């Protein structure tokens, strides 16, 4: 996996070039927003259980056929499977967010996921309803606009970070 | 690419864990030491050609026998590649200073290097000569700040220690 700096270095390398001055100033911007980024990550991981059962309960909320016989959240074993998968995806997008790169999300989690699901019978339109709910639960927590819980941070615009985390959730909703 | 962020994330991934305090502190350290390795990195990137050229001249000064027929400097094309290799290494040091870890050096130039040089008759000592020269040549505060000297000197010692 790569992070923000390794990603700049891989791109510089494809041209056999030392790191541009433009790229250095981008990276020092990355560094300037270091602490906002850490607060972003902290606001997701401190609420991970909330985010994952919100999203799965919601998925089932909008389509109760999932928990009728033959649906993929039917037994306790499949419900627990789905909760684990929600948790796993959220973990790899919190890696992405802390990394500044989607490298690890794509490499260690999304690669072959679409196939695995096709094989198992896991409804993909539903996985992405869950992931899209997690997207909003998460950008709420980042932006500190979640209804039932706040997290004291200093006053600033965290919108670039929220958009980042939403772009990683969309990478997931697209891998399948 | 080995680095604070990658090392920490993949420790946590190995464990099934979300990031926690250790992980966030680790990145915070990346923030603190950022500003002097990027200084080294920019000074190196801004003067790479003169550094590469003094280092290669120092190498062939120490080992004039390399210019003999049969040695790795018996032709102008071969000597020029020698300085090219030195530049590759300094580019990778640039990367290493920007990432914050020895990743780029590790994968892109250390990995095959003993086999490759064993096979094309490139004495390990000549590169060590060129990096030692560069290291000792650096001057504080002329060439860069003290804690950037530390970072630069450090990557050079790492690459030196990979040829011993």
């Amino acid at each position, epitope marked *: 996996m790569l992070d923000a700096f390794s990603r700049v270095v891989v791109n510089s390398d494809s*041209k056999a*070039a030392y790191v541009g001055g433009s790229d250095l100033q981008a990276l020092k911007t990355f560094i300037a927003d270091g602490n906002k980024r850490l607060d972003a990550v902290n606001s997701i991981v401190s609420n991970a259980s909330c985010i994952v059962s919100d999203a799965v309960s919601g998925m089932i909320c909008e389509n109760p056929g999932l928990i009728a016989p033959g649906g993929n959240c039917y037994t306790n074993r499949r419900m627990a499977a789905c909760l684990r998968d929600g948790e796993i995806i959220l973990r790899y997008t919190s890696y992405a967010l802390l990394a500044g790169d989607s490298s690890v999300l794509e490499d260690r989690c999304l690669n072959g996921l679409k196939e695995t699901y096709i094989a198992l019978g896991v409804p993909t339109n539903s996985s992405v309803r869950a992931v899209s709910i997690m997207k909003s639960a998460a950008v709420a927590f980042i932006s500190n606009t979640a209804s039932q819980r706040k997290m004291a941070t200093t006053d600033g615009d965290c919108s670039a970070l929220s958009s980042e985390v939403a772009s990683y959730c969309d990478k997931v909703a697209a891998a399948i | 690419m080995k680095s604070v962020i990658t090392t920490t994330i993949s420790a946590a991934d190995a464990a099934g864990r979300f990031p926690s305090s250790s992980d966030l502190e680790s990145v915070q350290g990346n923030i603190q030491r950022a500003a002097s390795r990027l200084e080294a990195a920019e000074k190196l990137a801004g*003067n790479h050609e003169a550094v590469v*050229k003094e280092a*290669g001249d120092a190498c062939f000064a120490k080992y004039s026998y390399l210019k003999n027929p049969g040695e790795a400097g018996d032709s*102008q*094309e071969k000597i020029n590649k*020698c300085y090219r290799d030195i530049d590759h290494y300094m580019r990778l040091i640039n990367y290493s200073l920007v990432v914050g870890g020895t990743g780029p050096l590790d994968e892109w130039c250390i990995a095959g290097a003993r086999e490759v040089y064993r096979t094309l008759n490139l004495p390990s000592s000549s590169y060590v000569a060129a990096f030692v020269f560069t290291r000792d040549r650096l001057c504080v505060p002329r060439d860069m700040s003290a804690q950037a000297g530390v970072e630069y000197g450090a990557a050079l010692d790492y690459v030196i220690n990979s040829l011993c």
Partner: T-cell receptor
Amino acid sequence: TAVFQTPNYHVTQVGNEVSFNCKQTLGHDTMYWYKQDSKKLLKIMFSYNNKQLIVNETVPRRFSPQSSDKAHLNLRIKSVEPEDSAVYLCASSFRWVGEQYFGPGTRLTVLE
Amino acid sequence: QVEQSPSALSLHEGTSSALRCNFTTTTRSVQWFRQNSRGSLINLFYLASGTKENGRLKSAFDSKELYSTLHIRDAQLEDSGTYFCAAEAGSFNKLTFGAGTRLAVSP
């Protein structure tokens, strides 16, 4: 062997577009464009290692140089202007150690 | 930058003379050319802090003193031309040329 450069001379009118070509049959990997003023003074304009431009000495936007091979370097000037009349010298060398080898040049007069 | 003297030189067949070239920053090497009438730059020397001899020409380069000279011995008529020193001084990425020395031998 030598640095070969065409055309030797060229007259055009302000606003036309010109293009000089330089090749080198030496074993080399770096090529340059120099501009010799009328006071017999050479200044470097461009340098190229492999395909990658490595020196660009604040030439105006009209001057644009295209390399295909490491033994080839061309320069096209568009919207040619009157103060661009001079001798354009192509050189060639190894990047890291070696002397520069020059070619015959291209005198360009730009007439009102 | 790079100051080359004398600007012009009118020598008799047989006379010997010198051209000097002074630099302001540290120089890695020096190249001496002579430009013929058709305008090609003929390479005379490329040296790094030494002496080199070539026929009737002799060049020297003192890197710590930042100077380089070209000596012409027993000047022949084929030696007329414009003579240039280029220094790899500065950041060792480009050649800087001097103003030239216009040298003309009369028989």
